[PDB]
UniProtKB/Swiss-Prot annotation:
PTM (free text): Palmitoylation of isoform 1 and isoform 2 is not required for targeting to postsynaptic density.
Covered range of the whole protein: 93 to 188 of 852
The protein, known as: Disks large homolog 2
Family: Belongs to the MAGUK family.
Subunit structure: Interacts through its PDZ domains with NETO1. Interacts with NOS1/nNOS through second PDZ domain. Interacts with KCNJ2/Kir2.1 (via C-terminus) through one of its PDZ domains. Interacts with KCNJ4. Interacts with FRMPD4 (via C-terminus). Interacts with LRFN1. Interacts with LRFN2 and LRFN4. Interacts with FASLG. Interacts with ADAM22. Interacts with DGKI (via PDZ-binding motif).
Tissue expression from the record: Detected in juxtaparanodal zones in the central nervous system and at nerve terminal plexuses of basket cells in the cerebellum (at protein level). Brain. High levels in cerebellar Purkinje cells. Expressed in pyramidal cells of the Ammons's horn and granular cells of the dentate gyrus in the hippocampus as well as cerebral cortex and striatum. High levels in dorsal horn of spinal cord.
Entry's transmembrane regions: none
Extent of the signal sequence: none
Originating organism: Rattus norvegicus
Purpose: Required for perception of chronic pain through NMDA receptor signaling. Regulates surface expression of NMDA receptors in dorsal horn neurons of the spinal cord. Interacts with the cytoplasmic tail of NMDA receptor subunits as well as inward rectifying potassium channels. Involved in regulation of synaptic stability at cholinergic synapses. Part of the postsynaptic protein scaffold of excitatory synapses.
Disulfide bonds: none
Subcellular location: Cell membrane; Postsynaptic density; Synapse; Cell projection, Axon
Domain PDZ positions: 8-94
Length: 102
């Protein structure tokens, strides 16, 4: 910050899981060598969509009490799957700043 904002979002797992897809990790970093776990898709009607807070391009930093800021993709996937039925996600989002260069 102020470039980013941070948010905690709790989801109750449903029959369609948490309702989103992720990409990234230390083994498959994005440009700039960013190992972050990023939301790439939110499915209609799933927990994330119904809660309405999560957005595509959000970066998941923590799942319950598991740090996922620097982990492999598979570990992130495991962290989310083993988090159980109530999942607390700590996320980072780029702050929309209406700035002007001087």
């Amino acid at each position: 910050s102020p470039e980013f904002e941070f948010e905690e979002i709790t989801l109750e797992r449903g029959n369609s899981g948490l309702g989103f897809s992720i990409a990234g990790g230390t083994d498959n970093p994005h440009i700039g060598d960013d190992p972050g776990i990023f939301i790439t898709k939110i499915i209609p009607g799933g927990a994330a969509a119904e809660d309405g807070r999560l957005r595509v391009n959000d970066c998941i930093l923590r799942v319950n009490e598991v740090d996922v800021s620097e982990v492999s993709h598979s570990k992130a996937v495991e962290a989310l799957k083993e988090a159980g039925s109530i999942v607390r996600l700590y996320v980072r989002r780029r702050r929309p700043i209406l700035g002007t260069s001087i």
